Amino acid sequence: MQDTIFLKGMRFYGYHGALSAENEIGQIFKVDVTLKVDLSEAGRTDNVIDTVHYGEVFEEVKSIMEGKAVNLLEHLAERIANRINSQYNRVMETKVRITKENPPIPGHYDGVGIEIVRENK
Template sequence: MHDTIFLNGLKFYGYHGALAAENEIGQIFIVDVTLKVDLTEAGHSDDVADTVHYGEVFEDVKAIMEGTAVNLLEHLAERIAKRINSHYNRVMETKVRITKENPPIPGHYDGVGIEIVREND
């Protein structure tokens, strides 16, 4: 099965980072979330109860990204994946990508970040 629900380009302002400047000034974080879900039942029923409500997933991600500051993107991604996998039993796998477009490091780039994939046990 290759069904997915995705939330792309979610933008949040936060103070996450290992560098003091990141904690003081803050920055915009871009989050992409992809959920592996069997969408067959929802496709037939036309009922939101038969899928994963992406508005609720957005609120879960927002609470973590705009919450208490942490040092590592890896930690934020783990928290997001754990929250989704533990609250939505239809999700078989969660992929989380977090990008910093303007971290305080010299150079020319579109962004830096991480991506994790976690199966739902």
């Protein structure tokens, strides 16, 4: 089963992070979310109820990203993957990638972040 639903480069201004001044100031978080969902039925019926609404998915992601400051990207991604797997039975698996393109690290780079994959069991 290789079909996916994706939301790519979602950007939220948040205050998450280990460092306190980091929580003070905040930064932009970029989030990719990929859902392993079987799409041939909705592909068959062209009815949205047969698939997972990507619109609703985005509001869920935003709630968490624009929610209470937490320490780790690992934790942020974990709560998004839960929220999504618990809300949508059709989702076999949830992949969550969170990037900080501009964290408090002196140097030159494009970004740093984590990615997790969480089967819905």
